[PDB]
Design an enzyme around this catalytic site. Structure first.
Site, PDB file in Angstrom:
ATOM      1  N   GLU A  11       0.861  -1.252   0.021  1.00  9.83           N
ATOM      2  CA  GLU A  11      -0.048   0.082  -0.012  1.00  9.83           C
ATOM      3  C   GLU A  11       0.648   1.296  -0.009  1.00  9.83           C
ATOM      4  OE1 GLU A  11      -3.714  -1.774  -0.416  1.00  9.83           O
ATOM      5  OE2 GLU A  11      -2.950   0.243  -0.518  1.00  9.83           O
ATOM      6  N   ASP A  20      -6.123   6.572  -5.389  1.00  8.21           N
ATOM      7  CA  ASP A  20      -5.917   5.337  -5.445  1.00  8.21           C
ATOM      8  C   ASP A  20      -5.647   4.969  -7.081  1.00  8.21           C
ATOM      9  OD1 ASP A  20      -8.523   3.473  -4.199  1.00  8.21           O
ATOM     10  OD2 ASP A  20      -8.073   4.066  -6.318  1.00  8.21           O
TER      11      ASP A  20
END
Ligand code: CL
Ligand code: CL
Length: 162
Positions: A11, A20
């Site tokens: 991540e 994202d």
């Protein structure tokens, strides 16, 4: 190697609102803030989450606090899901890490949609489940991460992460 170190590799860490891979407003270690196009809706969600006026920026500590919640929430979600819990119960410690990973990324609902793969994991048919999970939008969208998770399921080791 543990779940935390694993997710931190997949991540990354960002102290400022960012988008994202899907275009959504995120912060910290993969903490999805909103699926809304509004940077304002995101800034709002963020302050509600931290409990202060952040103005799209948080501290490392705050990011870690969010991260501990998200992992806990994912773990409890799996244990509360009638589709997921048996799979989990059935697996070894490393593979368990692989399923928490998917859940954190895609939500219980999404992982639960991998019916066939889940069935093969349950049956310990490692190679087959790996082949089947690759046939997914998930894998086509984020192939390097997907490959890492998939290897973890296939082999049972932390190789892909070392
Ligand atoms: Cl496909
Ligand atoms: Cl990727």
């Amino acid at each position: 190697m543990n779940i935390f170190e694993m997710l931190r590799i997949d991540e990354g860490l960002r102290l400022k609102i960012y988008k994202d891979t899907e275009g959504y407003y995120t912060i910290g270690i993969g903490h999805l803030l909103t699926k809304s196009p509004s940077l304002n809706a995101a800034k709002s969600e963020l302050d509600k989450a931290i409990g202060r006026n952040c103005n799209g920026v948080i501290t490392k500590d705050e990011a870690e606090k969010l991260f501990n919640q998200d992992v806990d929430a994912a773990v409890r979600g799996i244990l509360r899901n009638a589709k997921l819990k048996p799979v989990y119960d059935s697996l070894d410690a490393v593979r368990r890490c692989a399923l928490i990973n998917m859940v954190f990324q895609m939500g219980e609902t999404g992982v639960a949609g991998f019916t066939n793969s889940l069935r093969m994991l349950q049956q310990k048919r490692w190679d087959e489940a790996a082949v089947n999970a690759a046939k997914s939008r998930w894998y086509n969208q984020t192939p390097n991460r997907a490959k890492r998770v998939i290897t973890t399921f296939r082999t049972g080791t932390w190789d892909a992460y070392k």
